[PDB]
Amino acid sequence: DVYAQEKQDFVQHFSQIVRVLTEDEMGHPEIGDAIARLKEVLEYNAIGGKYNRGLTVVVAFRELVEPRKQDADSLQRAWTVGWCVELLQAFFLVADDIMDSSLTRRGQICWYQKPGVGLDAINDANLLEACIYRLLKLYCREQPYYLNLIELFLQSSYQTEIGQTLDLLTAPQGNVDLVRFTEKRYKSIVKYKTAFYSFYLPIAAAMYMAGIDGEKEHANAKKILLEMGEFFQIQDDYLDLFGDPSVTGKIGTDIQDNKCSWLVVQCLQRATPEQYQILKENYGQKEAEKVARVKALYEELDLPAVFLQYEEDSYSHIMALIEQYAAPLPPAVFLGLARKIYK
Amino acid sequence: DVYAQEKQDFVQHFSQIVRVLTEDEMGHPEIGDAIARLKEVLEYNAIGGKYNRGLTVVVAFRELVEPRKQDADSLQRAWTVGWCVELLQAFFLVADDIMDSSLTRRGQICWYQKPGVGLDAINDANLLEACIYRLLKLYCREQPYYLNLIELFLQSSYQTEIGQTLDLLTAPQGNVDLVRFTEKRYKSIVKYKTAFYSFYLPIAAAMYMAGIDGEKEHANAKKILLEMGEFFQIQDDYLDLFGDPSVTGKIGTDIQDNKCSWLVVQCLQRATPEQYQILKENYGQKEAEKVARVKALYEELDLPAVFLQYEEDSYSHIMALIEQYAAPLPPAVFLGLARKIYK
Ligand SMILES: O=C(O)[C@@H]1Cc2ccccc2N1C(=O)OCc1ccccc1
Ligand SMILES: O=C(O)[C@@H]1Cc2ccccc2N1C(=O)OCc1ccccc1
Ligand SMILES: O=P(O)(O)C(O)(Cn1ccnc1)P(=O)(O)O
Ligand SMILES: O=P(O)(O)C(O)(Cn1ccnc1)P(=O)(O)O
Ligand SMILES: [Mg+2]
Ligand SMILES: [Mg+2]
Ligand SMILES: [Mg+2]
Ligand SMILES: [Mg+2]
Numbered sequence: 086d087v088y089a090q091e092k093q094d095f096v097q098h099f100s101q102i103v104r105v106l107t108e109d110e111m112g113h114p115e116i117g118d119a120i121a122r123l124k125e126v127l128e129y130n131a132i133g134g135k136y137n138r139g140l141t142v143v144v145a146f147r148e149l150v151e152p153r154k155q156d157a158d159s160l161q162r163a164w165t166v167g168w169c170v171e172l173l174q175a176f177f178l179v180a181d182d183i184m185d186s187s188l189t190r191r192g193q194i195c196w197y198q199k200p201g202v203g204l205d206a207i208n209d210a211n212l213l214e215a216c217i218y219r220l221l222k223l224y225c226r227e228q229p230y231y232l233n234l235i236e237l238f239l240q241s242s243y244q245t246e247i248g249q250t251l252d253l254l255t256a257p258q259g260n261v262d263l264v265r266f267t268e269k270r271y272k273s274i275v276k277y278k279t280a281f282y283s284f285y286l287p288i289a290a291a292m293y294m295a296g297i298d299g300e301k302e303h304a305n306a307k308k309i310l311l312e313m314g315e316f317f318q319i320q321d322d323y324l325d326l327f328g329d330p331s332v333t334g335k336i337g338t339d340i341q342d343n344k345c346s347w348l349v350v351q352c353l354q355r356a357t358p359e360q361y362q363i364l365k366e367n368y369g370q371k372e373a374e375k376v377a378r379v380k381a382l383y384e385e386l387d388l389p390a391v392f393l394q395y396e397e398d399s400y401s402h403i404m405a406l407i408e409q410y411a412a413p414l415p416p417a418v419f420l421g422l423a424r425k426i427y428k
Numbered sequence: 429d430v431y432a433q434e435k436q437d438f439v440q441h442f443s444q445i446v447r448v449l450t451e452d453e454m455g456h457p458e459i460g461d462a463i464a465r466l467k468e469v470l471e472y473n474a475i476g477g478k479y480n481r482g483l484t485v486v487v488a489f490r491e492l493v494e495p496r497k498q499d500a501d502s503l504q505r506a507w508t509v510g511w512c513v514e515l516l517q518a519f520f521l522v523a524d525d526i527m528d529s530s531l532t533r534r535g536q537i538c539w540y541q542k543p544g545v546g547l548d549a550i551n552d553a554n555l556l557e558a559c560i561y562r563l564l565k566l567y568c569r570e571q572p573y574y575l576n577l578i579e580l581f582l583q584s585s586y587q588t589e590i591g592q593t594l595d596l597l598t599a600p601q602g603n604v605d606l607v608r609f610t611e612k613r614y615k616s617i618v619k620y621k622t623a624f625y626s627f628y629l630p631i632a633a634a635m636y637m638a639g640i641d642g643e644k645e646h647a648n649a650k651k652i653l654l655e656m657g658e659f660f661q662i663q664d665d666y667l668d669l670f671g672d673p674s675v676t677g678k679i680g681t682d683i684q685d686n687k688c689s690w691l692v693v694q695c696l697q698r699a700t701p702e703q704y705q706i707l708k709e710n711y712g713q714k715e716a717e718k719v720a721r722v723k724a725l726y727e728e729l730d731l732p733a734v735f736l737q738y739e740e741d742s743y744s745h746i747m748a749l750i751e752q753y754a755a756p757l758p759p760a761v762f763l764g765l766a767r768k769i770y771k
């Protein structure tokens with residue numbers, strides 16, 4: 086619930102973020118048109134979501150930083166670092182949507198699918214990434230955690246890109262080979278493509294801002310955070326096909342994209358020799374009839390009920406990890422995050 | 429000539445760079461396939477060029493750093509930073525080729541056009557960028573210029589992306605409006621899209637490694653370097669159409685891509701009302717006949733002779749800037765670079 090009481094101030098900070106990023110134009114009028122494009126990119130791709138990853142930085146900041154140190158400037162920096170996380174997210178999603186041939190995101194047409202944008206979105210994505218470091222220098226350059234944050238964001242990007250590489254390599258277009266969709270491969274993919282930037286990153290950022298830079302403290306937090314991230318991507322895969330379109334704001338493409346989704350992995354582990362053949366002949370193709378066939382097989386194997394059971398077991402597992410690794414950090418930090426991802 | 433005597437050791441260092449980047453796999457076997465992809469990306473996109481931008485770092489390093497300080501480890505770091513520049517280059521070119529719809533680069537098919545690669549190249553490009561910061565941390569983390577280099581590379585990337593944004597915004601596909609192709613717009617585009625990363629970056633990196641971090645010294649160097657960069661992009665535009673394919677290693681696409689090329693700008697300034705109409709009806713289109721028409725108009729306006737004259741005048745201008753701004757740096761640093769770009 087701490088997220089709702091911090092959201093407003095966090096979202097209102099976006100205006101300032103845009104202002105500060107588009108104030109590099111006054112000193113260099115010649116790049117005005119580029120700065121205008123940037124503003125359009127930011128407003129279209131950084132706004133429209135729930136902002137939970139960025140909000141996590143803020144929430145954790147206020148729970149880790151002693152009130153007497155939560156001055157106006159410190160809070161400002163916290164809101165900025167939180168937006169940097171949202172920008173990192175935006176950067177990856179713009180590119181991910183092109184690579185996954187997606188149609189919508191956050192209830193609107195994907196940026197690259199917008200008339201007049203197309204592949205220019207690739208550079209737009211690179212600009213969003215660049216903005217992260219511009220804001221860090223502008224707001225935190227004099228802070229003792231400056232270098233830690235720069236390296237954290239850079240490291241998190243590398244891990245995410247390694248993950249994306251695995252994601253794409255395991256899903257060759259027009260090349261269906263179910264044998265590569267194993268539980269071990271799946272866990273490695275999601276750990277790198279989602280767990281680091283969506284969960285470890287936000288909390289780690291707040292920790293560094295709070296002066297908590299101990300390798301041990303970060304390792305223990307990551308123990309909890311990477312497990313939550315795994316659950317989050319599984320839930321993401323589930324929703325890709327069984328989620329309510331009006332709620333997810335995006336059209337699923339995992340089956341058509343031949344992805345190593347939690348669903349197909351669960352399918353292969355429960356499928357009979359016959360069902361296996363059906364999956365093999367209908368997976369990884371654009372034909373709506375073939376996709377529908379795969380979904381029918383998943384429903385026949387009660388995958389939705391399987392996911393619901395996994396969600397409960399996962400929840401209990403994550404809570405167990407919190408009892409073990411939260412200390413010396415306030416359990417609320419992890420509990421609040423968990424409450425946000427589990428229903 | 430100092431470039432030829434440093435090339436060998438610089439190129440042989442590539443093996444080590446790859447080794448070090450693919451040694452993050454031993455500790456994390458799960459990302460092996462991703463690391464293998466990375467190696468393939470690096471070998472295909474970081475090797476095959478002249479390596480002059482990276483070599484510039486090395487050459488400048490040995491001319492700025494006192495011999496007694498050019499120890500084995502220091503030289504190693506120099507070769508690494510030089511490769512970081514080549515990787516930054518690779519990152520931008522992989523994406524630039526997709527965005528410019530290019531066919532070949534360095535005498536081979538563009539990475540994204542390789543069968544089986546396609547838009548996955550977007551993430552490959554992001555990985556190359558990430559490698560820069562991984563090498564900087566691995567080789568220079570303990571150096572006093574560490575943060576300076578990190579910020580230099582990040583800043584240079586932002587400037588290049590701003591430039592690319594201008595490049596793309598001024599060249600809307602299927603939307604020909606010659607009125608936007610002005611000399612002022614052209615100079616701003618090339619300053620940001622090429623001058624910073626190809627010329628200021630390499631020299632600035634070597635300066636920081638040599639302990640030269642003065643804002644004044646960097647500003648004076650940039651005065652010379654940004655002007656060389658402008659000349660280099662003009663020459664790049666000239667070669668896009670009039671260059672020897674077997675020498676450039678790439679197929680020109682500026683006319684088809686409706687680009688604000690130095691050529692079209694020079695054309696508009698010398699074109700008669702009639703020639704202007706011919707340009708307008710044939711520019712920015714894929715039809716080989718229409719492209720040929722534009723080239724004929726350029727040859728009719730003696731643009732090739734115009735470029736040759738500009739090259740001589742530019743050379744004299746750059747040399748004049750060196751007499752004025754080289755000090756206290758060795759003039760050879762700039763002269764060597766100039767000898768490399770001017771014939
Ligand atoms: O609702 C959304 O927009 C995303 C999609 C989703 C599906 C199920 C559960 C949570 C969420 N989300 C979400 O943001 O959850 C909160 C969160 C917090 C930190 C990191 C990732 C997600
Ligand atoms: O030959 C090449 O591969 C590129 C293409 C080219 C055309 C004309 C003149 C120089 C060059 N090059 C080049 O690398 O020149 C040297 C250089 C040095 C530092 C920064 C950029 C280019
Ligand atoms: O399913 P993906 O991994 O592509 C996704 O979750 C994005 N993503 C990319 C890396 N991590 C997550 P999205 O469904 O939002 O398209
Ligand atoms: O002409 P471009 O600017 O696209 C080019 O010079 C690449 N580039 C991109 C930014 N700076 C230079 P290339 O002709 O190598 O495709
Ligand atoms: Mg996706
Ligand atoms: Mg994806
Ligand atoms: Mg998904
Ligand atoms: Mg190009």
Ligand SMILES: [Mg+2]
Pocket residue numbers: 524528595
């Ligand atoms: Mg280009």
Ligand SMILES: [Mg+2]
Pocket residue numbers: 664665668
């Ligand atoms: Mg060119």
